RNA sequence: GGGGAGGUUUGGCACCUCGAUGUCGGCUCGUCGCAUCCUGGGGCUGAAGAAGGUCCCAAGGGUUGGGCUGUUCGCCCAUUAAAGCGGCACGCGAGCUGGGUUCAGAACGUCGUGAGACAGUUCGGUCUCUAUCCGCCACGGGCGCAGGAGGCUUGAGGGGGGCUCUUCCUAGUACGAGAGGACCGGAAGGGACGCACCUCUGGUUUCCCAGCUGUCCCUCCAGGGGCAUAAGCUGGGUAGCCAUGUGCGGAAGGGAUAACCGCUGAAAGCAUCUAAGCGGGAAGCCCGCCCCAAGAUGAGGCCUCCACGGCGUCAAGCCGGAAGGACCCGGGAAGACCACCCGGUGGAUGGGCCGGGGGUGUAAGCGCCGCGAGGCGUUGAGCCGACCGGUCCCAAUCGUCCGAGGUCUU
RNA sequence: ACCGGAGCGCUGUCUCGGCGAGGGACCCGGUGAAAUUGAACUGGCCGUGAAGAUGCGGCCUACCCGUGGCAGGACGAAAAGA
RNA sequence: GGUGCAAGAGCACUCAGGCGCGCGGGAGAACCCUCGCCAAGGAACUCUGCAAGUUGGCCCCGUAACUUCGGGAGAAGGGGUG
């Protein structure tokens, strides 16, 4: 129920009498590291890893933390709780049957410290009938002397952008297993050449 | 597909081809309007010889100076607006509609008789 | 938000075209300068291209250049001295270096800029 | 129009003063010569990286 | 590796070889056939025949924006290696440069005036 | 006729504020209560059906756009499931406006011998750049978690999100003389709102490509440059950033209960839902779905790399790591500075160069046609900002400093 | 260059916002002020007190310092209430 | 002073002749000032179409109520310009 992935385009083609509008991710196949089960822990998961990143540039505790399964070498490796792998690999034409729904988790586009105008969409002053100095930032925060404070759920101006998000209940048109893509009808968050994970719901019934 | 207050051609009765848009007419809060939506409206330029005089009527909104990214993605615009009179159920004023042709204003399909009834290139 | 949007901003942006062009002047007289580094790693996208038409040949070229330099001297002349040395090397004829000592007044770090032999 | 009120006292004043300490810079030597340059220019006494380019011809 | 090298794998059995319909021009007239189909399963070949007015391209191209004058001017863009179309057949070729995206003929309504281009 | 709660209304009394506690409306942002306007769960009828009347529980979610007047209020046109009542110094002016009334000017009516005057009317009238401390929204620097480091993580706790309508199978039957016309279930599309994203439809793109006018200069014709918005004016526009564009969402389930309805059943061997026991029951509570989170002084949990040697019995004092690491440089879909991420020649990290994608729209020159403005062939050419790539041609040359010598005990 | 109503022509005043350029703000070198001021080792809610508490009472929360920002409080500032 | 604008001491370049305004260098956030476009709808904003945008020079044709016979008139509304 899993996969390591990065997203590459939106791009769309014709598939049934109409044309849907998918993404393009790949997944070359990933090599699990640990697995973890009953004794001493609860975080059941088998551990990911990516691509190839030129085996010198690596220090000796990822070297022989990383040798005692033997996979090469990664940049990335990640955690997906709740599933068993019966082997060595995990390849994307074992899992996906080409109609089911699925779902996406990636790290967002981070746009820097963006206003409250673009922060928390509410609005500012007018423009022309006398508006001396204010055209876009907020009103009041808050009311004379009976609280003496400033409440602290408040919306406000400050940071935004690259948070970790989700995406839900997407299908997954058509694979190919020649190549190692994937297609996806959807948004799938990120900027491309970022890393993706993609794990099922279809649980969510009816 | 923007209609808050707007002039629009009649293509049809009244005796001259203006009108006023009051209220889009779907839930309470709807502040747009594409084709096929019958909107409440206003006569307001004249009438020789009478039938619609200075009252106010309903109307199926034909064709909209805007996109229709439709289900295989053509898109077919124009660039004129018009709506035709219903009577205050379902029906028309009379059995002629001169506009402009199908291209498929059937599309809330609650209305044949329209797309029946017109005919072809002006 | 600058994303992914390069060449940098310095003085203004018809200032800009009359700075590239009275720094293009000078390198190709007296062969090295020294300016200031922000100055100086963006200079070499334009005085790098001038030469790469420069060996390229014909009037369409010697007409072409003309329009960045105005001058009958400078194009008659480096159309036959620095022009036939580079007919063994595919780009990057120039050469920014960095200096150790700052510019008191203003403490800003200085760079000297010359084409490669 | 935004005035302030009391005073600050000498033990808060130099507690914001605690955090602007300034770093020396970083040296090394110049390896054709026997002296200290900021590792990454042009030396102005010995010379070069590969080929001289300054001091004194 | 990225977009340019694996997503021409994907489109190209689509667009492998695109139905070839030949020669877009510019400017020309044009009658398209589509298979407008509805109605409970009945297809309706219909053609229209029409004034180019502009197109753009990235391999999803769009045959785009095509204008006729019925009285009321109708006007409808469409995709081009879609698999809507039959046959695309151009009647005569146009000229005046001044390329895609041609848009004067809007306001420009006289037909006496749209054929002295 | 009698008994009370509430502090939202015009009052009563004068206790702090006259070496100053800036007004009624309108914007912008709100959180709260219930004597509930809609959604949901129930008893009673002068409830046949569909609709209705009044009472008991219930605060999750929602309460539209306009004409007149300074208006809060009120009367109206068009819809809707409805178009609620109240507090928060009659919320909010170191956040904005100045229409209203009572600052200096002037006039109409009316009282006065007169200066003047009248909650009687009418037209004009200055609203202040720098946040010291609590409070709020985001990001940092030290010593802590008893060898020194890297990596992946569980969750105490806390936040966000919670809508609603219409048509159609059931079926037009049960119901009722008829006219009319359902409970329970079952599908589809739509409205407002929220989090992400560029392929379509649309928008910007300060120099990417062309056209045109005036005037000084390159050298006279040709061909070009500077200036006439911090672009001279007009027709186009890639990546980037967004919406008037596309994708999904709000649940299914599990428990415990509210008004209400029961099962056995005593004290009360004709009975009764009870304090002995057990069961049914809502958009409301807890768990479920996403997001931060061991700074949870209760300082968490696992896997891997180095522990070589000493010693005069005080050893908290030296150089010192295949551990590891900052300062320095070439950078970026990360960024106010730091922070994070990817590189440092056994390199493809940026600049140039080559091959595409993509913009404009048929370059200068010579040869033909016309007395001249021009036209026609070479030619879908030429110029080419960032998108996807291949290529040691130019740049990251050389180097420098801190860090365990695992403690109380057997 | 007066004051009150109504139409037509065109429009970012609006439904409802979006992108772009220059001068500041942000960082680094040079010089470098002013109104204000009892002393400060300056948290939240219930309640009392000359009857709107960071200084008193009982419970919950909070590791030591700083840099950009937004304006609820200090019955904030100025003017011995017109 | 010299050219082009129907004219001119106006507007646009520019001769002689002066000057670049006595703090600099980088990055390119929120927010404010001075600007440029936008689409579908054109006053729905508002105390008030306030502000901004529309037509804008010269020539020809044509021109209403009322009037103290001058005027209303640049009425309105149209075509031309290299």
Redesign the pocket.
Known sequence: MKGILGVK????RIFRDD???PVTVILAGPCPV?Q?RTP????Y?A?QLGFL??N?????????????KAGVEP???????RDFNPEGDTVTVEIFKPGERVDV???????????????????????????????????????????????????????????????????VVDVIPEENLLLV??????????LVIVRE?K???? | ????????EVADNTGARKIM????????????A?VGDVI?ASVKEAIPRGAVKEG?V?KAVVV????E?KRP?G?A?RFD?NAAVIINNQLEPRGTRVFGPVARELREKGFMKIVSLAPEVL | ??????????????????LYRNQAKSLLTHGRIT?????A??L??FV??LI??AK?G????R??V??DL???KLVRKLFDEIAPRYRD??????????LAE????????LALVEL?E | ????????????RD??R??HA??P???????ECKAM?????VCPECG????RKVLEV | ?????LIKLVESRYVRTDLPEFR???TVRVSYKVKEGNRTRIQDFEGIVIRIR?????????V??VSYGVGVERIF?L?SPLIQKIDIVQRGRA??????????LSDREIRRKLRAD
């Open positions: 385009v939106g791009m769309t044309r849907a509008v640990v973890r001493e822990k609860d975080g998961t551990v990143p030129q010198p540039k690596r220090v000796n505790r990822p070297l022989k933390g990383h040798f005692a940049v990335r490796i990640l955690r997906e709780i988790t990636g790290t967002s586009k981070g746009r820097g410290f963006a206003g409250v105008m673009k922060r928390w969409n509410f609005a500012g002053g007018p423009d022309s009938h006398g508006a001396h100095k204010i055209h876009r930032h907020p009103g009041s925060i808050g009311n004379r002397k009976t609280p003496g404070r400033v409440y602290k759920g408040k919306k406000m101006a400050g940071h935004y952008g690259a948070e970790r998000v989700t995406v839900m209940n997407l299908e009808k959807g948004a799938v968050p990120g900027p491309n050449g970022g719901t649980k969510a019934a009816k | 597909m923007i209609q808050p207050q707007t002039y629009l848009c009051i209220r889009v007419l779907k839930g309470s809060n709807a502040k747009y594409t409440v106010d309903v909209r100076t805007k996109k990214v993605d898109s615009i607006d | 938000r600058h994303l992914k949007s390069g060449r940098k901003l310095n003085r203004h942006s018809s200032h800009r075209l009359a300016t200031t580094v922000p100055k790693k963006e070499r996208g790098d291209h790469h038409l390229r014909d009037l369409h070229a007409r072409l003309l329009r105005q001058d009958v090397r595919q780009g990057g004829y120039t050469r920014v270096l960095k700052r510019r008191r007044g203003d403490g800003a770090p490669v | 129009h935004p005035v302030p009120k009391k005073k600050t006292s000498k033990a808060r507690a914001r605690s955090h300034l770093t810079p970083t040296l090394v030597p110049c390896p340059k900021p590792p990454h220019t070069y990286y590969a080929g | 590796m990225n977009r340019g090298a877009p021009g510019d502009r197109n753009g391209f990235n391999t999803t191209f769009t785009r924006k863009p995709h000229r005046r440069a001044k390329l895609y995206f041609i848009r004067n």
